[PDB]
Design an enzyme around this catalytic site. Structure first.
Site, PDB file in Angstrom:
ATOM      1  N   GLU A  39       0.826  -1.208   0.000  1.00  0.00           N
ATOM      2  CA  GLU A  39       0.000   0.000   0.000  1.00  0.00           C
ATOM      3  C   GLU A  39       0.863   1.262   0.000  1.00  0.00           C
ATOM      4  O   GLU A  39       0.676   2.174   0.808  1.00  0.00           O
ATOM      5  CB  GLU A  39      -0.973  -0.001   1.181  1.00  0.00           C
ATOM      6  N   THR A  44       1.176   2.658  -9.166  1.00  0.00           N
ATOM      7  CA  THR A  44       0.693   3.941  -9.671  1.00  0.00           C
ATOM      8  C   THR A  44       1.766   4.656 -10.481  1.00  0.00           C
ATOM      9  O   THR A  44       1.472   5.257 -11.521  1.00  0.00           O
ATOM     10  CB  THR A  44       0.219   4.817  -8.512  1.00  0.00           C
ATOM     11  OG1 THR A  44      -0.839   4.154  -7.810  1.00  0.00           O
ATOM     12  CG2 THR A  44      -0.286   6.158  -9.023  1.00  0.00           C
ATOM     13  N   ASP A 124       7.881  -4.085 -12.021  1.00  0.00           N
ATOM     14  CA  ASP A 124       7.521  -4.117 -10.580  1.00  0.00           C
ATOM     15  C   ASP A 124       8.005  -5.436 -10.000  1.00  0.00           C
ATOM     16  O   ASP A 124       7.931  -6.438 -10.710  1.00  0.00           O
ATOM     17  CB  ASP A 124       6.019  -3.967 -10.369  1.00  0.00           C
ATOM     18  CG  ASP A 124       5.567  -4.123  -8.930  1.00  0.00           C
ATOM     19  OD1 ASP A 124       5.816  -5.194  -8.352  1.00  0.00           O
ATOM     20  OD2 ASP A 124       4.951  -3.178  -8.407  1.00  0.00           O
ATOM     21  N   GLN A 128       2.644 -11.023  -2.697  1.00  0.00           N
ATOM     22  CA  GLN A 128       2.031 -10.624  -1.404  1.00  0.00           C
ATOM     23  C   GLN A 128       3.037 -10.247  -0.312  1.00  0.00           C
ATOM     24  O   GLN A 128       2.893  -9.153   0.252  1.00  0.00           O
ATOM     25  CB  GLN A 128       1.276 -11.819  -0.828  1.00  0.00           C
TER      26      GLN A 128
HETATM   27  N1  LIG Z   1      -4.212  10.490  -2.566  1.00  0.00           N
HETATM   28  C1  LIG Z   1      -3.229   9.712  -3.038  1.00  0.00           C
HETATM   29  N2  LIG Z   1      -3.396   8.394  -3.089  1.00  0.00           N
HETATM   30  C2  LIG Z   1      -2.311   7.762  -3.590  1.00  0.00           C
HETATM   31  C3  LIG Z   1      -1.129   8.316  -4.022  1.00  0.00           C
HETATM   32  N3  LIG Z   1      -0.261   7.328  -4.462  1.00  0.00           N
HETATM   33  C4  LIG Z   1      -0.926   6.213  -4.291  1.00  0.00           C
HETATM   34  N4  LIG Z   1      -2.178   6.405  -3.768  1.00  0.00           N
HETATM   35  C5  LIG Z   1      -3.167   5.385  -3.443  1.00  0.00           C
HETATM   36  O1  LIG Z   1      -2.534   4.126  -3.406  1.00  0.00           O
HETATM   37  C6  LIG Z   1      -2.980   3.311  -4.518  1.00  0.00           C
HETATM   38  C7  LIG Z   1      -1.799   2.583  -5.100  1.00  0.00           C
HETATM   39  O2  LIG Z   1      -1.481   1.454  -4.261  1.00  0.00           O
HETATM   40  P1  LIG Z   1      -0.912   0.159  -4.998  1.00  0.00           P
HETATM   41  O3  LIG Z   1      -0.945   0.378  -6.470  1.00  0.00           O
HETATM   42  O4  LIG Z   1      -1.563  -1.056  -4.436  1.00  0.00           O
HETATM   43  O5  LIG Z   1       0.609   0.175  -4.522  1.00  0.00           O
HETATM   44  P2  LIG Z   1       1.494  -0.992  -3.895  1.00  0.00           P
HETATM   45  O6  LIG Z   1       0.856  -1.461  -2.642  1.00  0.00           O
HETATM   46  O7  LIG Z   1       2.911  -0.550  -3.874  1.00  0.00           O
HETATM   47  O8  LIG Z   1       1.324  -2.143  -4.986  1.00  0.00           O
HETATM   48  P3  LIG Z   1       1.512  -3.724  -4.777  1.00  0.00           P
HETATM   49  O9  LIG Z   1       2.609  -3.862  -3.760  1.00  0.00           O
HETATM   50  O10 LIG Z   1       1.889  -4.284  -6.124  1.00  0.00           O
HETATM   51  O11 LIG Z   1       0.195  -4.247  -4.272  1.00  0.00           O
HETATM   52  C8  LIG Z   1      -3.684   4.294  -5.456  1.00  0.00           C
HETATM   53  O12 LIG Z   1      -4.687   3.636  -6.214  1.00  0.00           O
HETATM   54  C9  LIG Z   1      -4.295   5.268  -4.457  1.00  0.00           C
HETATM   55  O13 LIG Z   1      -5.443   4.731  -3.843  1.00  0.00           O
HETATM   56  C10 LIG Z   1      -0.958   9.719  -3.965  1.00  0.00           C
HETATM   57  O14 LIG Z   1       0.025  10.385  -4.309  1.00  0.00           O
HETATM   58  N5  LIG Z   1      -2.085  10.349  -3.447  1.00  0.00           N
END
Ligand SMILES: Nc1nc2c(ncn2[C@@H]2O[C@H](COP(=O)(O)OP(=O)(O)OP(=O)(O)O)[C@@H](O)[C@H]2O)c(=O)[nH]1
Ligand SMILES: CN[C@@H]1CCc2c(ccc(O)c2O)[C@H]1O
Lengths: 294, 54, 337, 247
Positions: A39, A44, A124, A128
């Site tokens: 998370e 993104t 990436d 999990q």
């Molecule tokens: N408001 C806001 N939300 C963000 C930002 N960056 C990420 N998010 C939130 O975080 C999400 C991205 O989380 P994931 O794509 O699961 O990132 P991650 O957990 O590193 O990915 P995995 O480890 O592959 O599961 C986005 O869809 C948003 O909900 C940001 O700069 N601003």
């Protein structure tokens, strides 16, 4: 037979022609590996390059968000969201749209793109979770390692409850990556993500960093600070986390190991513009140091 | 939960097996090695005429 | 509750006592009478070149003339060991490959890696165009090894503490094996293709059954990770190479560890082990850029192969025992004889 | 003791240099540097052994054609080595100052080395082949079978093409590299480079610059420098072939 050996030589020549052609492409590519905790926003950033450089799922997130808030107990319960885990992309959907939804990913997640006559390869890591990460020995030739952390999550706990807060999990993971035998000559680019959420949290007086981090009380803002315009309270908190990551690197850091801190917000297209990433990727001083000590 | 119950049942099956003396196993290994040591190209070098790689 | 756990702890005491009563004499005492093999010196007959990145896997052919290699740039080259002539160069859908295989009939090649998917390729086909036949994709976590019982069945060992027996025609898991608490890193089929072993990451190796589908035995004498395993030519023993410098030999019938191989000046790891044709020499790779040759019965080093420039990550011995091939991370293969 | 002792030092120096150069002679820069080893080996094999015999009071008087070839080989050997350093500096500037395109500019397809060697040989063997050189003292010297001289600004062309032109590039090329490093180090914060540049350039300068000054001076005006001092300057300048600090 004489013709039997002649055909084999001809077959060998054809393959050798393709290998020489493919040797050029492999050399002129730059490979970057993403890292971070759960998370955080690794996926993104990758989606940003697709948008710039080169429907049931959305409602599914909204379906889970509504049930989660009610189960703990509506608006009042949303404010005190630190106690119970809840998806960040909740308010936006309840009230860049395609980038807000979160989709879980297991398989490696690659991406090819070109910026200025140069090929870049960003992928990436996935998965999990792990405490062994035995595949880390494979990535011994990447040019840089990109690290992404959640700078607005210091009062929330890991998915396994009754554990350390999310920020401390990032610090422990950073130490293991930095002090790794295989990754002893790889630089790190540090992305402090989720800047907008941090500003909102600091403005409200619901929670204070001093409670979770006792050392913040006596911290004084650095003299060489450049608040881009900017309350002093927000700027001091923003810098304290950045300096806390740096003291890990400088302690065990050596001649080859470097570290690049940055401030960025993932959803905004302007803040993820690969222009500064391109400058940082080309500012690597391996070329100089190497020919001769210079 | 019931993970221990499932696991503890497995050890019962593994426990009830027949074991032989180490001397018999060592003798069998020694006899097999002594019998089949004749046709071992890596152990006793072969003449270059019969070597397909040289 | 605690009573169930108490029974589990109690049973572990019975196993140790049973093993103690079966140790009449050590292997070293009996083997002391034989004569040493002596110094072994071999030279690189041929060197195979053409790869761009590190080699992670290698498997010989049935005829002991053709071998297939896998690299990290997404290439699968089939060589001709006699005259050093490549026959094929199959591009891959991904650049991350950790395993390779070769069919007993020579008409198929397998591959896999971090994509959680095991692919199968066709060599002998109309018009001479190699294409993917099936893409088995039911797993989670990376793969480590692949083997062929025949042209229709393939066994894989994924990284989620599971192993499965696939089926090419239907593309479904006939059976699955569970019981490891750590990642599975290697396996080796029996000479009769009825049983196989697997070295997990929790310092424990088991002896599974292909048909029935449940574990039989468990050896846990190591102290670190396990990276390699190989069956004795007899079929009643196997040798295990672990993360620490020690390599140990186990026995199926007695159920206990027979002998250990180690040296004071070596503190590196082991990445691949294998036997000879008659089961007298136990070759093993190392992280110090070379290979060492041990003795099965005498437990002494009897030769070092140091013609490489990087770590050795694969090794294999031909069916007729006429050559030994070792890959490395410097994009170079070698043949020793 | 004095005359024989000097010959012992020079003979040992010629033989000592040959051992070092041959041992060294991978990447494109290694292929570039191989020319230096080849030139040093050729010098030690051909020119250096004759130097002590000629410097000895007795002259060998081996022949006229052989003497012409031996004199001509000096220009080919010296010009080839000095010109390659400019190419190495240009390659380093391309690699360091411009980060991308290093791989789209440099290719395996040798050609530049052949062109440089041909250019070096163009000015060396041709004047010997045409045999038309240049005074009463200058004349009658070749009648009896060694004087060195130049007329019609042959030395000027030889010096500019072989020495003056490389040093024009050297200052411009190496000034940019040092300037970039100084600003780059400040970024990390907010001696070694200077020592490296000094070690790289001081030997070259102090070995070659004084010689060509006298080379240009002796022909420009009347006799102000002796033959022995010019020969000693040439001998001191030949040390750079064995001195060449790389790897
Ligand atoms: N408001 C806001 N939300 C963000 C930002 N960056 C990420 N998010 C939130 O975080 C999400 C991205 O989380 P994931 O794509 O699961 O990132 P991650 O957990 O590193 O990915 P995995 O480890 O592959 O599961 C986005 O869809 C948003 O909900 C940001 O700069 N601003
Ligand atoms: C006698 N030695 C010679 C004479 C002058 C000369 C040399 C080298 C390069 C030149 O361009 C020259 O003009 C010397 O090696």
């Amino acid at each position: 037979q004489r013709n039997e050996e002649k055909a084999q030589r001809e077959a060998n020549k054809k393959i050798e022609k393709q290998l020489q052609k493919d040797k050029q492409v492999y050399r002129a590519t730059h490979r970057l590996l993403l890292l971070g905790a759960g998370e955080s926003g690794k996926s993104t950033i990758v989606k940003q390059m697709r948008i710039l450089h080169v429907v049931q799922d959305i409602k599914n997130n909204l379906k889970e968000a509504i049930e989660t808030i009610v189960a703990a107990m509506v608006r009042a319960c949303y404010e005190r969201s630190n106690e119970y885990q809840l998806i960040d992309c909740a308010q936006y959907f309840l009230d860049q749209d395609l980038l807000r939804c979160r989709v879980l990913t297991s398989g490696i997640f690659e991406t090819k793109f070109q910026v200025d006559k140069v090929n870049f390869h960003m992928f990436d890591v996935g998965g999990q979770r792990d405490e062994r990460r035995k595949w880390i020995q494979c990535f011994n030739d990447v040019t840089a390692i990109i690290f992404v952390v959640a700078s607005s999550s210091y009062n929330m706990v890991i998915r396994e409850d009754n554990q350390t807060n999310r920020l401390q999990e990032a610090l422990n993971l950073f130490k293991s990556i930095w002090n790794n035998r295989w990754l002893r000559t790889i630089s790190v680019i540090l992305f402090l993500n989720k800047q907008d959420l941090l500003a909102e949290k600091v403005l409200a007086g619901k929670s204070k960093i001093e409670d979770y981090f006792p050392e913040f009380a006596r911290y004084t803002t650095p003299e060489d600070a450049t608040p881009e315009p900017e309350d002093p309270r927000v700027t001091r908190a923003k810098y304290f986390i950045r300096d806390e990551f740096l003291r890990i690197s400088t302690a065990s850091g050596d001649g080859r190991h470097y570290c690049y801190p940055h401030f960025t917000c993932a959803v905004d297209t302007e803040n993820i513009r690969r222009v500064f990433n391109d400058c940082r990727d080309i500012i690597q001083r391996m070329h100089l140091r190497q020919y001769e000590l210079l | 939960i019931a993970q221990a119950r499932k696991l503890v049942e497995q050890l019962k099956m593994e426990a009830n097996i027949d074991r032989i003396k180490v001397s018999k196993a060592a003798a069998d290994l020694m006899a097999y090695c002594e019998a089949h040591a004749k046709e071992d190209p890596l152990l006793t070098p072969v003449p270059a005429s019969e070597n397909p790689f040289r | 509750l605690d009573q169930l756990r108490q029974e589990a702890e109690q049973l572990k005491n019975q196993i140790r006592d049973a093993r103690k009563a079966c140790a009449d004499a050590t292997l070293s005492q009996i083997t002391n009478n034989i004569d040493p093999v002596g110094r072994i010196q071999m030279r690189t007959r041929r060197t195979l070149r053409g790869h761009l990145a590190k080699i992670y896997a290698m498997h010989w052919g049935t005829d002991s003339r053709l071998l297939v290699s896998a690299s990290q740039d997404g290439k699968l080259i089939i060589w001709d060991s006699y005259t050093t002539n490549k026959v094929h160069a199959i591009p891959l859908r991904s650049s991350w490959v950790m395993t390779c295989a070769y069919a007993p009939s020579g008409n198929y090649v397998a591959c896999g890696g971090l994509d959680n998917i095991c692919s199968i390729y066709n060599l002998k086909t109309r018009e001479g165009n190699v294409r993917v036949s099936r893409e088995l994709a039911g797993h989670t976590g990376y793969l480590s090894c692949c083997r062929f019982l025949d042209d229709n069945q393939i066994v894989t060992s994924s990284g989620d503490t599971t192993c499965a027996l696939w089926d090419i025609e239907t593309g479904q898991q006939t059976t699955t094996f569970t019981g490891h608490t750590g990642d599975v890193m290697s396996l080796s089929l029996a000479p009769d293709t009825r049983l196989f072993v697997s070295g997990a990451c929790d310092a424990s190796a088991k002896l599974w059954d292909v048909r029935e589908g449940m574990c039989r035995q468990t050896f846990t004498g190591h102290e670190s990770d396990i990276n390699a395993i190989c069956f004795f030519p007899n079929g009643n023993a196997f040798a295990t190479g672990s993360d620490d410098a020690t390599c140990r030999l186990f026995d199926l019938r007695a159920d206990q560890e027979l002998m250990t191989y180690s040296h004071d000046n070596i503190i590196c790891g082991i990445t691949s082990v294998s036997f000879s044709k008659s089961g007298r020499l136990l070759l093993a790779g190392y992280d110090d850029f070379n290979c060492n040759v041990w003795d099965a019965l005498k437990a002494d080093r009897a030769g070092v192969l140091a013609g490489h420039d990087n770590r050795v990550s694969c090794l294999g011995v031909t069916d007729d025992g006429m050559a030994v091939a070792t890959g490395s991370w410097d994009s170079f293969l070698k043949i020793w004889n | 003791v004095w005359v024989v002792g000097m010959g012992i030092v020079m003979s040992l120096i010629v033989l000592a240099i040959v051992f070092g150069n041959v041992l060294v002679i991978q990447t494109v820069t290694n292929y570039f540097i191989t020319s230096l080893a080849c030139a040093d080996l050729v010098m030690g094999l051909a020119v250096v052994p004759f130097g002590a015999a000629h410097i000895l009071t007795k002259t060998w008087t081996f022949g006229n054609f052989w003497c012409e070839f031996w004199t001509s080989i000096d220009v080919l050997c010296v010009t080839a080595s000095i010109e390659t350093l400019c190419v190495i500096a240009v390659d380093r500037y391309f690699a360091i100052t411009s980060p991308f395109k290093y791989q789209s500019l440099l290719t395996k397809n040798r050609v530049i080395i052949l062109m440089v060697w041909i250019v070096s040989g163009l000015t060396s063997f041709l004047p010997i082949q045409m045999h038309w050189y240049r005074h009463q003292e200058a004349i009658n010297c070749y009648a009896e079978e060694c004087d060195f001289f130049t007329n019609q600004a042959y030395a000027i062309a030889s010096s500019i093409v072989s020495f003056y032109v490389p040093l024009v590039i050297m200052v411009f090329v190496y000034s940019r590299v040092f300037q970039e490093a100084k600003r780059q180090l400040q970024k990390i914060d907010k001696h070694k480079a200077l020592k490296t540049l000094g070690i790289i350039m001081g030997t070259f300068t102090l070995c070659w610059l004084p010689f060509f000054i006298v080379n240009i001076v002796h022909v420009i005006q009347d006799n102000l420098i002796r033959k022995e001092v010019y020969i000693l300057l040439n001998w001191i300048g030949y040390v750079n072939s064995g001195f060449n600090i790389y790897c």
